[PDB]
DNA sequence: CAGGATGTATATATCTGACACGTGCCTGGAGACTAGGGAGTAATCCCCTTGGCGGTTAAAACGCGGGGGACAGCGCGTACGTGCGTTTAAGCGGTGCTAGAGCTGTCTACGACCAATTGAGCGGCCTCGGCACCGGGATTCTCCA
DNA sequence: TGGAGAATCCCGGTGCCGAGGCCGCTCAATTGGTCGTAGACAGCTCTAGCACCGCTTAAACGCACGTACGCGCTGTCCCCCGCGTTTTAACCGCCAAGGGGATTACTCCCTAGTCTCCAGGCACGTGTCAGATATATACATCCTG
């Protein structure tokens, strides 16, 4: 009667994709929740600041891409950017 | 008449007598080769030969002048791409690898170029066996149609050894295998978990080339798991030991493999049939087999005929499942023409009705 | 009501072991008790501030997680 | 005369939710407006990072002959990676433990 | 005679044992008492969720382990193996907590 | 065209003449004072935003600013800044 | 009608602008609504802190026989006070210099 | 441009050390200091150029530098803030 | 004979001189060249405002001074007066930059 | 070295409670449509960044002598580790109670929005006085008998 | 405990450019009113923190013995520092050209807002199997005669 939402459904789907015989504890599924929320807040705050620096009013894919390039180190940013651009490109083709 | 079969099995044991000396000499040169490949500086630093045994039950072998060994190579984070949606051939890519991939020169863009890496393998192996000439050993280069580098040794006379590169991955036994290795109700679930925590292998083989990227396709290999299960072939893992009861599983396996070997070579039209078909069928027969009493050498001939019945029933309904990948069932007409499978059936009729005359050789 | 002597000497030796320490002088215990007291005082001051602002009486796990996150010591596994 | 729904995560080809991320971006005081391709990008990135961590964790799990991932395995995955350990350098994982190391001089 | 171990072997065994575990190395009732006593200066008649005390304990143990690592580094730097309050003071001064 | 810009120079100068009726200020020091005011404005405003978000609210009030000031400033700075702020709001609401 | 205007900082009794702070709070994406007493509090606190810095800075400028504050005096003020040094602990001041300090072990 | 890290002369590292309060300096300190300065500069200029590219400009302004420093915990007063 | 000063007096005089100034202690043209060379890897044909190079120089000099302070502390800790690369490495390892 | 003692990784047998599905349903996300304003673009100005040249002098660079500090070696003595027998209090299981968190409904005061006035703060212009900067003499401070 | 070199503070005069004040104006804050909804109270439920009581046993504690490690002293030998000479290249003043930042005007398309509808994700309930625990072995390592 106090419905509260999380990310565990999608974390579990991803797990069944990468390791389709492995489970997860109940504390690891809390740690992954905290991790997703932390990274979300980081990326979103940096994109907000980026749009404020350039006198814009909207947050677009370009702000998210620049925020990802600012926050992730080294080869993490290259792969994350490729993932994002592939996803957006596939989405617009509909 | 299991005595005639038993003495032909003894005959196989006399190939074995010739082949302990032949196999030891080849093994020794390859072993020296192995130690030499691990010291030289190249992308092949840690390359073991993967041991699946030496026995006929364990290795590729035919007429005494041809041997096979498996060389394994551990590979970094690998991502597979299904190319034959049957589920038998793959493209290989990498993942992030933050430190560095010491193989990027072997890739065409994002896909691993098997051809280039194999070319480097061939070059390095030929040069290295060329750099030490104790035993008269040379390299032969045949058509680039099946990627195997065959050494010819003149000691005592022609010894051929096809060297097959195999990549080793430790990751997860990909999803195409998810309901492979079904033994849970036969041996147990604890073994299956343990077996499936082992690594798996990818071997270069160009799936017939209705495709652009050639060589760049790979097939799955589970040679180590297969050797383990076969050498603990029984519901009682005590099989083939003094601690347990000798059964007729291995005898039937040798009987069908060699019978087929002789019949297929004497009628060369049917060469699309490979030794893996017999292993897959016997895997299915041993897993559905609930009874240890269904395998005992005094009933060798009856179990073997039952196996023949199993073989015809597998043939009949147009599918023979890959024991590790049920989604890839190799008994598709597109790789074996229907008439040829039935022609083999006719040959089976031929063998079955004639009282194994092809065995009346010596 | 000292309660700082309840962080015993074997417990401090165990914390030192987990950190890769082989030998330990005898004046390390009284110093690390003070260090721990300072750290706890800071974190609990901030947690109680977060608690009073919500007009609550109990300190929850989220107050602690926020007080930690605002000192550069993010903690995973207790919500958030 | 409807167009029976097709989730945005399905169009993007993702497992993470695009509409929930859109809502969280709008009701979070980040900007006045939010573009149409921003939640798609952000959910793709979150899914990439999640998969990247979970794979190294399942590897550490199945090394110790385990089936379920525990926090120790997440910790071993984070700390044995010079980039994920730079992204989470000042994060503490509950029940995670430390990485085993002894200084050479102490042996 | 029986089996006197030489000074430094049980210490290495304990290092290897506690670098492999994940438990909490401080007793829980004393820590809880200490937390309540510290907090009764900022506001009286407080209450604590169990998760709050567990979070505080996890954070404090992580802090102290991470500080003992730098203390050990400073000791090694000074051509020693015993850690002394000088090393804790140097570590906390370089880290910026002073 | 000339693109008017804002700064806190007028108010910093008034405060200076009110605390030191004889001293002047350089221009680089005035730049430093502008950067300082912008910095701690941002700090307090972001902390109060987070506070309002944790507690399900949608408004920033003087209570949020009070507790953000108690979280950010150390020791006696917080005590005196809270006294100043409360005194000012009391005077203001009295019109 | 329309009695004479009166700035909000005049009523509050401050020298910092309450209207500009209200606008900067309403345009900075901090919350949906901004109460009426929040910019007054915030301007009072900003004014307190700037006067607290400028007093020490003018003292440092006077102890050098100078009538004009420069960045060096701001740095001296900040680094010498114990509470302003915890607030501005991770800040670099352009043309500020350091605090003259030699370790005792190095003296002759 | 090549071999410009050598323009951080040794008599200048000595002055930075004097301002840092050090009395006697080894002879291997200068290469260490050049390497440290080079990695610091790389880390700051990468972020300043990311900001610049996002703004679609071709000159690096002082605000790009101030933001790149602020996002690493090295806030700098006096250049726009 | 004339006025040989003993080793360590001009060093203390320089300490007192440079702890009282506010100037920049690195030449400006070499620093600007170094900055442009470093930046020509991330994007070619860039331009710089003078204020940008001045900001970079101020930040870098503040960083290096603050690091030499901790290097000196580590040297004093190790019962020395000469600073060595060991001390820089210890300082940057404790601070968390490694 | 070579045995001897101890500790640790390794196999089985048993039981449990925590994880993985499965079901019911409600709330939040999707489909379709409209209306405005933000952003993309094109053109134009004019600032300021880059490039060059010539002279000067300050700083860097190179050499050299020597003294002081880093570093290795040797001895001693004491403080810390290891092991054992006592003793204290932590941990676990169970019971009872009530304070306080969490939610729900009502309503009222408070903050957004808008339209018209008007003064505060910004940009530009001008001027003197605070502060570099050079001389020139006073007075500290270091280095030896 | 002196006395002389040589930095360093202190006073004095000149001069220059930047801070401080004035003026004109425009746009952003104030005043006055309306409206809708966020949040403040008032009640009620029922979770979960707090206080207690036995009981077992694991961990803390205190003590003794001995050894290895910290610390102090001595001695040598490089290697950094202080000074002097040479050279090189920053720095300052200057002029020139053009790239690109910054602003304006115009138009369109992209996003917010609403309304209707239905499926996905949440809460609750089972069922069973991965893992925790206990016992028995075998291999690995440290230590001392
Ligand atoms: Zn058998």
How distant is the Cα of I67 from the closest Cα of chain E, in angstroms? Answer: 10
CA distance C7 to C36: 10
DSSP structure class, residue E47: E
Q: Which chain H residue shows the shortest CA-CA distance from G92? A: H76
Q: Which bases of chain J are contacted by protein, using any atom under 7 A from a CB? A: 5-8, 18-20, 27-32, 38-40, 48-50, 59-61, 66-71, 79-84, 89-91, 99-104, 110-112, 117-124, 130-132, 142-144
Q: Residue D76: which of D65, D84, D68 has the closest Cα? A: D84
Q: Residue F58: inside a domain, yes or no?
A: yes
CA distance G79 to F33: 16
Which secondary-structure segment (H or E) carries H39? helix H29-54
Classify each residue of B211-226 as buried b or exposed e, where b means 16 or more C-beta atoms within 10 Å of its C-beta.
eebebbbbbbbbbbbb
- How many helices and strands in chain H, by DSSP H and E? 3, 3
Q: Residue A2: inside a domain, yes or no?
A: no
Report yes or no: B73 and B44 within 8 Å, Cβ to Cβ: yes
Q: Which pair of structure tokens corresponds to residue H24? A: 């006697």
Q: Which pair of structure tokens corresponds to residue C52? A: 């009073």
Report yes or no: G76 and F14 within 8 Å, Cβ to Cβ: no
C-alpha distances in Å from residue B206, one per residue of B89, B91, B113, B148: 9, 11, 12, 12
Q: Count CA atoms within 13 Å of residue B146 on its CB side.
A: 5
CA distance F57 to D27: 12
CA distance B107 to B93: 8
Torsion on CA atoms H26, H29, H30, H33, rounded to nearest 10: -150
Q: Which residue is nearest to nucleotide K4 (CA to C1')?
A: I3
CA distance B40 to B81: 32
Question: Domain ranges in chain B?
Answer: 1-14+173-199+222-362, 15-172+200-221
Residue B236's φ and ψ, nearest 5 degrees, are -85, 120
Report yes or no: A87 and D44 within 8 Å, Cβ to Cβ: yes
What's the gap in Å between B284 CA and the centre of ligand 1?
Answer: 16
Report yes or no: G25 and G38 within 8 Å, Cβ to Cβ: yes
**Coil vs helix vs strand at I20:** coil
Torsion on CA atoms B225, B261, B354, B304, rounded to nearest 10: -10
Establish if G33 touches chain D: CB-CB under 8 angstroms.
no
CA distance F41 to B303: 88
Smallest Cβ–Cβ distance between I76 and the set G97, G105, G108 belongs to G105
Q: Find which nucleotide's C1' atom is closest to G22's CA.
A: K29
Establish if A73 touches chain H: CB-CB under 8 angstroms.
no
Q: Residue E38: which of C58, C43, C66 has the closest Cα? A: C43
| I95 burial via Cβ count (<10 Å: 0-12, 13-18, 19+) | middle
Q: Which pair of structure tokens corresponds to residue D70? A: 């525990």
Report yes or no: A84 and D55 within 8 Å, Cβ to Cβ: no
C-alpha distances in Å from residue B304, one per residue of A34, B130, C59: 61, 48, 76
Q: Residue A30: which of B163, C79, H24 has the closest Cα? A: C79
Partners of residue I59 on adjacent β-strands: none
Neighbours of B151 (CB within 10 A): 21
Position of tokens 């995955």? D77
**Coil vs helix vs strand at F59:** strand
Contact C49 F55 (CB under 8 A): no
CA distance A63 to A49: 9
Structural domains of chain G, count:
1
Q: Which residues of D touch A42 (CB under 8 A)?
A: none
Q: Which pair of structure tokens corresponds to residue B359? A: 């065995």
Position of tokens 């005595």? B3
Structural domains of chain F, count:
1
Q: Count CA atoms within 13 Å of residue B121 on its CB side.
A: 24
Establish if E79 touches chain I: CB-CB under 8 angstroms.
yes
Touching, I vs H (3+ Cβ pairs under 8 A)? yes
Torsion on CA atoms B115, B120, B125, B126, rounded to nearest 10: 90
Partners of residue B159 on adjacent β-strands: B153
Position of tokens 């096979």? B68
In sequence order, which residues have a C-beta less than 8 Å from that of residue B281 and are 6 or more positions away? Answer: B310, B311, B314, B320
Neighbours of H72 (CB within 10 A): 13
Partners of residue G97 on adjacent β-strands: none
DSSP structure class, residue G106: G
**Coil vs helix vs strand at E92:** helix
Q: What angle do CA E94, E96, E97 make, to 5 degrees?
A: 115
Q: Which pair of structure tokens corresponds to residue B85? A: 């949606």
HEC string of chain B equals CHHHHHHHHHHHHHHHHHHHHHHHHHHHHHHHHHHHHHHCCCCCCCEEEECCCCCCCCCCECCCCCEEEEEEEECCCEEEEEEECCCCEEEEEECCCCCCCCCHHHEECCEECHHHHHHHHHHHHHHHHHCCCCCCEEEECCCCCCCCEEEEEECCCEEEEEEEEEEEECCCCCHHHCCCCCCCCCCCHHHHHHHHCCCEEEEECCCCCCCCCCCCCEEEECHHHHHHHHHCCCCCCCCCCCCCCCCCHHHHHHHHHHHHHHHHHHCCCCCCCCHHHHHHHHHHHHHHCCCHHHCCHHHHHHHHHHHHHHHHHHHHCCCCCCCCCCCCCCCCCCCCCHHHHHHHHHHHHHHHHCCCHHHHCC
Polymer length of chain E: 98
Report yes or no: E15 and D101 within 8 Å, Cβ to Cβ: no
Report yes or no: G40 and F62 within 8 Å, Cβ to Cβ: yes
Classify each residue of I42-68 as buried b or exposed e, where b means 16 or more C-beta atoms within 10 Å of its C-beta.
beeebebeebbbbbbbbbbbbbbbbbb
In sequence order, which residues have a C-beta less than 8 Å from that of residue F69 and are 6 or more positions away? Answer: F44, F78, F81, F82, F85, G45
Structural domain for H31, as ranges:
1-81
Strand runs (DSSP E) across H1-81, as ranges? 24-25, 59-60, 75-77
HEC string of D46-90 equals HHHHHHHHHHHHHHHHHHCCCCEECHHHHHHHHHCCCCHHHHCCC
Smallest Cβ–Cβ distance between D103 and the set E20, E65, E76 belongs to E76
Q: Which chain D residue shows the shortest CA-CA distance from A76? A: D83
Q: Which residues of I touch H33 (CB under 8 A)?
A: 64, 88
Q: Residue C71: which of E61, F47, B4, G74 has the closest Cα? A: F47
CA distance F74 to A89: 50
CATH number at residue F89: 1.10.20.10
In sequence order, which residues have a C-beta less than 8 Å from that of residue I21 and are 6 or more positions away? Answer: G97, H19
C-alpha distances in Å from residue F48, one per residue of B324, F27, F42, G10, G87: 59, 32, 10, 25, 17
Partners of residue B73 on adjacent β-strands: B47, B167
Structural domains of chain H, count:
1
B219 in a known ligand binding site:
yes
Q: What angle do CA G39, G40, G42 make, to 5 degrees?
A: 60
Report yes or no: A74 and D84 within 8 Å, Cβ to Cβ: no
CA distance I34 to I54: 13
Residue D69's φ and ψ, nearest 5 degrees, are -85, 130
Resolution attained, angstroms: 3.0
Partners of residue H24 on adjacent β-strands: I82
Which secondary-structure segment (H or E) carries I61? helix I50-77
Q: Give the CA radius of gyration of chain C.
A: 16
Polymer length of chain G: 108
| C79 burial via Cβ count (<10 Å: 0-12, 13-18, 19+) | middle
Q: Which pair of structure tokens corresponds to residue G107? A: 């003296």
Question: Domain ranges in chain E?
Answer: 9-98
Touching, F vs G (3+ Cβ pairs under 8 A)? yes
Structural domain for G39, as ranges:
1-108
Report yes or no: F58 and G35 within 8 Å, Cβ to Cβ: no
- Give break positions in chain I: residue before each, C–N beyond 2.5 Å: none
Q: Which pair of structure tokens corresponds to residue I40? A: 């020509």
B52 in a known ligand binding site:
yes
CA distance H54 to B92: 35
In sequence order, which residues have a C-beta less than 8 Å from that of residue F52 and are 6 or more positions away? Answer: F58, F59, F60, F64, G31
Establish if F36 touches chain H: CB-CB under 8 angstroms.
yes
CA distance F91 to B294: 100
Partners of residue B218 on adjacent β-strands: B90, B204
Classify each residue of F8-43 as buried b or exposed e, where b means 16 or more C-beta atoms within 10 Å of its C-beta.
beebbbebbeebbeebebbebbbbbbbbbbbbbbee
Q: Residue A83: inside a domain, yes or no?
A: yes
Partners of residue D91 on adjacent β-strands: C74
CA distance D65 to B194: 8
């Amino acid at each position: 009667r106090s419905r509260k939402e999380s990310y565990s459904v999608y974390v579990y789907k991803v797990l069944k994709q990468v390791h389709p015989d492995t489970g997860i504890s109940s504390k690891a599924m809390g740690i992954m929740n905290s991790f997703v929320n932390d990274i979300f807040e980081r990326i979103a705050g940096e994109a907000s600041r980026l749009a404020h620096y350039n006198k814009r009013s909207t947050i677009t894919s370009r702000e998210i891409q620049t925020a990802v390039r600012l926050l992730l180190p080294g080869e993490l940013a290259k792969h994350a950017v490729s993932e994002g651009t592939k996803a957006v490109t596939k989405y617009t083709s509909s | 008449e299991p005595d005639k079969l038993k003495k032909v099995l003894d005959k196989l044991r006399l190939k074995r007598k010739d082949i302990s000396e032949a196999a030891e000499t080849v093994n020794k040169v390859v072993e020296r080769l192995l130690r030499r490949m691990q010291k030289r500086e190249s992308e092949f630093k840690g390359v073991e030969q993967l041991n699946t045994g030496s026995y006929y039950e364990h290795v590729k072998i035919s007429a005494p002048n041809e041997f096979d060994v498996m060389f394994k190579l551990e590979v970094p984070r690998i991502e597979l791409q299904e190319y034959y949606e049957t589920g038998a051939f793959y493209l290989v890519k990498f993942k992030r690898i933050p430190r560095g991939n010491p193989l990027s020169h072997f890739l065409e863009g994002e896909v691993l170029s098997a051809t280039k890496m194999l070319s480097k393998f061939r070059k390095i192996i030929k040069e290295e066996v060329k750099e030490i000439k104790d035993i008269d050993v040379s390299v032969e280069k045949e058509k680039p149609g099946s990627p195997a580098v065959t050494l010819l040794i003149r000691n005592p006379e022609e010894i051929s050894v096809d060297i097959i590169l195999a990549l080793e991955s430790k990751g997860s036994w990909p999803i195409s295998t998810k309901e492979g290795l079904p033994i849970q109700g036969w041996l147990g679930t604890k073994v299956r978990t343990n077996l499936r925590r082992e690594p798996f292998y990818l071997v270069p083989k160009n799936a017939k080339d209705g495709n652009s990227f050639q060589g760049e396709t790979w097939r799955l290999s589970f040679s180590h798991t297969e050797k383990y299960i076969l050498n603990n072939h029984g519901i009682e893992k005590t099989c083939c030991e003094s601690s347990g009861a000798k059964c007729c599983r291995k005898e039937c396996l040798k009987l069908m493999k060699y019978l087929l070997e002789q019949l297929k070579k004497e009628f060369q039209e049917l060469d699309a049939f490979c030794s893996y078909h017999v292993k897959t069928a016997i895997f299915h027969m041993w897993t559905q087999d609930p009874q240890d009493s269904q395998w005992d050498p005094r009933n060798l001939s009856s179990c073997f005929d039952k196996l023949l019945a199993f073989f015809l029933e597998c043939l009949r309904t147009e599918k023979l499942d890959h024991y590790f990948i049920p989604k890839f069932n190799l008994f598709s007409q597109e790789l074996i023409d229907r008439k040829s499978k039935e022609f083999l059936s006719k040959k089976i009729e031929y063998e079955r009705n004639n009282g194994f005359p092809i065995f009346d050789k010596l | 009501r000292d309660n700082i002597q309840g962080i015993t000497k074997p417990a401090i030796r165990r914390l030192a072991r987990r950190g890769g320490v082989k030998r330990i002088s005898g004046l390390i215990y009284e110093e690390t008790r003070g260090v721990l007291k300072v750290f706890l005082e800071n974190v609990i001051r901030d947690a109680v501030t977060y608690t009073e602002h919500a007009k609550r009486k109990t300190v929850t796990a989220m107050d602690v997680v926020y007080a930690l996150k605002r000192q550069g010591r993010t903690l995973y596994g207790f919500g958030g | 005369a409807r167009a029976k729904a097709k989730t945005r995560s399905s169009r993007a080809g993702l497992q993470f939710p695009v509409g929930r991320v859109h809502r969280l971006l709008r009701k979070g005081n980040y900007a006045e407006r939010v573009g149409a391709g921003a939640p798609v990008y952000l959910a793709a990135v979150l899914e990439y990072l999640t998969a990247e961590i979970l794979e190294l964790a399942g590897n550490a799990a199945r090394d110790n002959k385990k089936t379920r991932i525990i926090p120790r395995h997440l910790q071993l995955a984070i700390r044995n990676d010079e980039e994920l350990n730079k992204l989470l350098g000042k994060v503490t994982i509950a029940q995670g433990g430390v990485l085993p190391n002894i200084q050479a001089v102490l042996l | 005679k029986p089996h006197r171990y030489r000074p430094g072997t049980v210490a290495l065994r304990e290092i290897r044992r506690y670098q492999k575990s994940t438990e909490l190395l401080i007793r829980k009732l004393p820590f809880q008492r200490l937390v309540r006593e510290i907090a009764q200066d900022f506001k009286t008649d407080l209450r604590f969720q169990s998760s709050a005390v567990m979070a505080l304990q996890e954070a404090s143990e992580a802090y102290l382990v991470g500080l003992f690592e730098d203390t050990n580094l400073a000791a090694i730097h000074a051509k020693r193996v015993t850690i002394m309050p000088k090393d804790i003071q140097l570590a906390r001064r370089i880290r910026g907590e002073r």
